[PDB]
Design a protein around this nucleic acid. Sequence first.
RNA 1: CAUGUGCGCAGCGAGUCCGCUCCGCGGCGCAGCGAAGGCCAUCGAGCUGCGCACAUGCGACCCGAUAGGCAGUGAACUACGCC
RNA 2: GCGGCGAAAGACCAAUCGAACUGCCUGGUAGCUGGUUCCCUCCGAAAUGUCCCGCAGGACAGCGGGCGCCCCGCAGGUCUGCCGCGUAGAGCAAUGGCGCGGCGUCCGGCGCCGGCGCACCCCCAAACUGCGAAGCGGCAGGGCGCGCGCAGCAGCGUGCGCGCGCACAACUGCGGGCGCCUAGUGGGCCGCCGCUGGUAAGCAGCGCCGGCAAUGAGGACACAACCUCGUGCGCGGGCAAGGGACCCCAGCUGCGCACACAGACGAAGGGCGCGGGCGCGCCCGCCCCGAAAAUGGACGGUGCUCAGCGCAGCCCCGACCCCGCGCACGCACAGC
RNA 3: AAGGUGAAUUCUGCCCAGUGCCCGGGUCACGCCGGCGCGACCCGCGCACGCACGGGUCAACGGCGGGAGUAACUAUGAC
RNA 4: GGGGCCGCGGCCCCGCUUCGCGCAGCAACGCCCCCAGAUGGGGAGUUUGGCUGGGGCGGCACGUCUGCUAGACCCCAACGCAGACGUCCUACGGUGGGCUCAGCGCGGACAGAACCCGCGCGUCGAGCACAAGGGCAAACGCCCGCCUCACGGCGCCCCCCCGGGUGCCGGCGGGAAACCGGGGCCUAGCGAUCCCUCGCGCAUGCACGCCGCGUCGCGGGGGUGGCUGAAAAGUUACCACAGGGAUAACUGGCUUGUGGCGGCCAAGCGUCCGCAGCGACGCCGCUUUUUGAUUCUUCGAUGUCGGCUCUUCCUAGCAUGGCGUGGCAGCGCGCGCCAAGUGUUGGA
Lengths: 49, 49, 91, 63, 164
Amino acid sequence: SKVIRRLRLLKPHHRPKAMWKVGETRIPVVSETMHGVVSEIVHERGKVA
Amino acid sequence: VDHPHGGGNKQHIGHPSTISKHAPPGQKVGLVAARRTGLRRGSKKVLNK
Amino acid sequence: VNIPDKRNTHCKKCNKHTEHKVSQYKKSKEGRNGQGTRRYRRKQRGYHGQTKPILRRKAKVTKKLVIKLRCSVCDAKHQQTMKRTKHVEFG
Amino acid sequence: AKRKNHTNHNQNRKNHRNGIKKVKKSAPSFRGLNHKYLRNMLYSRKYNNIGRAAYEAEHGPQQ
Amino acid sequence: MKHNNTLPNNHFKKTAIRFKTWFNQPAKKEKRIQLRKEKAEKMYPMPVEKLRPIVRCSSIRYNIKQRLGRGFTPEECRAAGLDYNYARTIGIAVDMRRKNMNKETFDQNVERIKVYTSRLTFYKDRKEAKASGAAQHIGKIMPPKKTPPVVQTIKVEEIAQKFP
RNA sequence: CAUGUGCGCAGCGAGUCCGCUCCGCGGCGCAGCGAAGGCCAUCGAGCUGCGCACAUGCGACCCGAUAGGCAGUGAACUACGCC
RNA sequence: GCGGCGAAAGACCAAUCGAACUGCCUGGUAGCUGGUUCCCUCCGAAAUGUCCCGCAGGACAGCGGGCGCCCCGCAGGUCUGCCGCGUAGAGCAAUGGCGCGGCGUCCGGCGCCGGCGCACCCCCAAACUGCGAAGCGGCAGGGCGCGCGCAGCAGCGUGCGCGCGCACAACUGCGGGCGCCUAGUGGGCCGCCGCUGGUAAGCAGCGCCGGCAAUGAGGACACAACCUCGUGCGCGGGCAAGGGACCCCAGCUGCGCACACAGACGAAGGGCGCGGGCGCGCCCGCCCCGAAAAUGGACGGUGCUCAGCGCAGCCCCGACCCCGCGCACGCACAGC
RNA sequence: AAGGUGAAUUCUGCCCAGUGCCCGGGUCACGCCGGCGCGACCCGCGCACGCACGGGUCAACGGCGGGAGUAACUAUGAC
RNA sequence: GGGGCCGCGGCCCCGCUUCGCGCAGCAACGCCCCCAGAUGGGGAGUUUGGCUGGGGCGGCACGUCUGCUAGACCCCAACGCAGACGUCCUACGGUGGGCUCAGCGCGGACAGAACCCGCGCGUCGAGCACAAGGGCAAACGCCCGCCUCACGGCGCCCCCCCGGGUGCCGGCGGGAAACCGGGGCCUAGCGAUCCCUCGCGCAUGCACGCCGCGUCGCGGGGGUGGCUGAAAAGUUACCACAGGGAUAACUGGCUUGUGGCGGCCAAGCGUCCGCAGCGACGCCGCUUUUUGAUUCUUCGAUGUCGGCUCUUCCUAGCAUGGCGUGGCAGCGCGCGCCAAGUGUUGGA
Ligand SMILES: [Mg+2]
Ligand SMILES: [Mg+2]
Ligand SMILES: [Mg+2]
Ligand SMILES: [Mg+2]
Ligand SMILES: [Mg+2]
Ligand SMILES: [Mg+2]
Ligand SMILES: [Mg+2]
Ligand SMILES: [Mg+2]
Ligand SMILES: [Mg+2]
Ligand SMILES: [Mg+2]
Ligand SMILES: [Mg+2]
Ligand SMILES: [Mg+2]
Ligand SMILES: [Mg+2]
Ligand SMILES: [Mg+2]
Ligand SMILES: [Mg+2]
Ligand SMILES: [Mg+2]
Ligand SMILES: [Mg+2]
Ligand SMILES: [Mg+2]
Ligand SMILES: [Mg+2]
Ligand SMILES: [Mg+2]
Ligand SMILES: [Mg+2]
Ligand SMILES: [Mg+2]
Ligand SMILES: [Mg+2]
Ligand SMILES: [Mg+2]
Ligand SMILES: [Mg+2]
Ligand SMILES: [Mg+2]
Ligand SMILES: [Mg+2]
Ligand SMILES: [Mg+2]
Ligand SMILES: [Mg+2]
Ligand SMILES: [Mg+2]
Ligand SMILES: [Mg+2]
Ligand SMILES: [Mg+2]
Ligand SMILES: [Mg+2]
Ligand SMILES: [Mg+2]
Ligand SMILES: [Mg+2]
Ligand SMILES: [Mg+2]
Ligand SMILES: [Mg+2]
Ligand SMILES: [Mg+2]
Ligand SMILES: [Mg+2]
Ligand SMILES: [Mg+2]
Ligand SMILES: [Mg+2]
Ligand SMILES: [Mg+2]
Ligand SMILES: [Mg+2]
Ligand SMILES: [Mg+2]
Ligand SMILES: [Zn+2]
């Protein structure tokens, strides 16, 4: 039989595009305490958060 | 040809949809390592053990 | 059937009529290193599947009875084919 | 498919085209003879014109 | 198959079976003769063949006969009085792997070298060689003569003496 | 075409066969039997070629599948996704 | 591309999709279908047996042809003789059924009724037989007689060697035996007689013989099989089957019978219809009723009422048959 | 991410035997080890996943029975 | 799961980092590699018999045996008839001796329909494992004694085998012996090559010895019942191809069971009264408008129901024309005859 759609969606051309991602959201690795200002609260495509 | 559930003359599964976790990919369709099935009706404590 | 344990019959080695102790012949297990056991074993190794037939339509519920005859004089061994039976006792 | 099972039609006509040939004549054979009789007949043929007592006087014990 | 016949052993089941035809066979023969003539003209005084030993054939089917061997052993060349490296410079073939097995094959080949070197005339260089006017030997040097075996005879009164 | 068998023809015949090659003690035959150890005749015309018929392998009297495989090419129609 | 893609239809993926297209393997394999190319001459089948994942196929055997060799007597036959069979018929005598009476120092019930017994009898039998055909089958019709040797067999013979002597065996026909190689065939069908299943069948399945297949020609109106009868190319004769009003070759003489758009599909049952016969009833011929299908129409047609149904006498026509002749071809060649 | 059902409303009963899934604690392969041997060997033992056994689970696959009597006529059968 | 994957420490456990890794972590495990189990229609190949009044389902004249079919040698077909076999038996085998069975009769305490015994008769009606047939009475049955011929080696025949028959040389048993016995009274009760296994071999290790580490020969056995012997589940209405009128699903043809129609007989019904009209029980036909049966034609295709439309034909006559009959007063109705000209509707 043909390949089921579950295996067929595992191929990497079905993943979401990288251009929708605003950036990697990592906690900064800091030696000393870092003081930041929240500059903007933005929306990412797909992400409700 | 499309699916393990892909059936005939009446829309039914036909075999247990709880599949093993050691199943081949292409067989892992439906409830893939189901400890139980059916409506829960209970606390987390009564169902997990 | 019921067979006696003892039977005076002709001994090929004695060339006499001597008493023979009677028991049933049962087939031994197949040895490890017969030429057909070896040839089948070398054929089975690898990715070859089942290279020989396995009979699946059996029909016979009996085997032919074979008696071992052991000479009390010679300690000679010889055999006799009797009829097919389901059951046999000695004595 | 279902067809004819058997006939003997044209078999007698076939069997008489080259005729019913007889048993073909041969040399007389010792096949089927009594063994004690055949053994003794050959002993009589072996010592045919010379007797056995004269034969074993020549060739020693013939057995 | 139908009738009484020997069972067929015809092996043309493979479609990869080739056929080697022999249409070059008369042409290769004239090429082979021409190269042999040109070899003889390249080595004008020197014989076209090496001197090869007489060896006995191997198995029990064939040890009744002798054939022409590959080369002489170095111990045969030494007993004949030659260094085997010198023996190759004159037209003698040398076999390093044949074993000196017995005195009869040894002494026959030692004599075979001695007869050969006695039959040689040397020349100074190539120009002296080509102008010699010496007829060169064509064919195998001292081949073993094939003969029907002569039947030896003894007297009948001597039969019990020789073979009791 | 190869290899057989049968028949016919041909040469020689206890021998026979030029055509691998620069020169077959290579094959078969002159005698078989047995798994073998062993036995060995009371004994027998073959060898080679040519031709036909026939058997078999080969595309195999000619033409014919649906299939199977190996290696490739296409998303200009159309399906979906993205820009 | 055993991949895609699919709001899912196995949809779509270049007019191609339940696995695209191109090239190759590849002239894939086919027990299946189709086709398979000159002439004459000589001969000429099988559709059966056994086995086979065998049933649309094979192999072996049988049958055909070709090639041989060998002189051994040969036969789809009759006669004579001896054995074999268990069918048709016949039989209830045993086995197994069928049925009533009759009989009774039998039993039961109330002289009767019922059982049982016996004897007669009845209807019977593919899986019954005290009998048993027609019909078939086997075998024999040639070597014998005497004598001598041999044997380990035997116990007083039997075989086998050898010699001498005798000798050609019912009828009729006639050359025969054996070997080698190879084809085709292995769906058969029909008739006769004998059957099996089936309500039956242009059904199905057998036996024997003959046919068709592969057999023309004549006659059947036409018509694989029926009848005659075989068949080179002609000529002459004579015929067969079948016919002899006209189609259409060939008919006349006499004796009957029948009237129904009959002859020209038919049953049980009928007919003061006619003709004969026997004792009003039967019998025999012909006729009538029973007797109704769908295109208009079929004794073959025309037609026929002596062209129908019967008979007798003489005759005639009619095949490639038979005979004779001639030629061709084949043969082992005064011929066939 | 994998499935089923297919808005709502009203509901979604019973069944874990079978099969499946899940969970938990006798049998089994090679190697190892051991015996034996001059060696090949041969002979044995130990064992995991699994099976087995025990348990869970049906909005997992699915499944969801008979026979008798019995009331103020009968009929029906609450029983 | 085991092994390989070259690290240190300490008590399989715990640290460690310097290997490795998806790398601030994990950590000498594991990745990885090598063997070995387990699972595995996710996938790959392939298979899924035949006979057959089409095929399927069913059943096996698919191997063997008996009686019949079978038509008087033998042979002889059908999804023909009636059955059977695949086992069973140390006796139910071998043999010797004796005996006579089934059944009937008449006697005999308890004792009865049926206990046991006796006498008389008793052609086989009994028994002989079983299916059937054949066979058999001082036996081929029953009983008892002694036995194990239910044996080895060579043959031969009937002959695919299976099975059986018959010899020879040994070895025996029973019997005084002749004799009999090579399993079962006879006819069924069984199985190739290769492989395995056992017994036996005056076999063998192709450079030579040795080691059962093997190989052979001979004879058994382990088995193919689809029984001359593949190792094998389905589905396809998405289907493909080669074909088949060798073969089904229409028509046609043969047949006519069934369907339809018509006769004959006359028990009986009909107030009386067989026949005004019916008509049982039976019997004889016809038809091809039903359905079967069959498989002859067609499968390189004859478009498969019904209707609509439109034409024609048959008569076994519904109406219309003429009649005969009545259990016909009239009216009507029944029955029958001749005649196929003209008709035979609209609707749920
Ligand atoms: Mg699937
Ligand atoms: Mg489904
Ligand atoms: Mg649904
Ligand atoms: Mg499944
Ligand atoms: Mg492996
Ligand atoms: Mg060829
Ligand atoms: Mg092709
Ligand atoms: Mg394939
Ligand atoms: Mg590809
Ligand atoms: Mg579909
Ligand atoms: Mg398209
Ligand atoms: Mg071709
Ligand atoms: Mg002819
Ligand atoms: Mg046939
Ligand atoms: Mg055909
Ligand atoms: Mg043949
Ligand atoms: Mg009879
Ligand atoms: Mg009779
Ligand atoms: Mg027919
Ligand atoms: Mg004719
Ligand atoms: Mg004709
Ligand atoms: Mg004609
Ligand atoms: Mg005339
Ligand atoms: Mg005229
Ligand atoms: Mg003529
Ligand atoms: Mg829906
Ligand atoms: Mg469960
Ligand atoms: Mg469980
Ligand atoms: Mg799988
Ligand atoms: Mg598959
Ligand atoms: Mg079939
Ligand atoms: Mg008979
Ligand atoms: Mg018995
Ligand atoms: Mg007995
Ligand atoms: Mg009896
Ligand atoms: Mg028997
Ligand atoms: Mg016997
Ligand atoms: Mg078969
Ligand atoms: Mg078979
Ligand atoms: Mg469907
Ligand atoms: Mg047909
Ligand atoms: Mg009818
Ligand atoms: Mg058409
Ligand atoms: Mg048409
Ligand atoms: Zn002994």
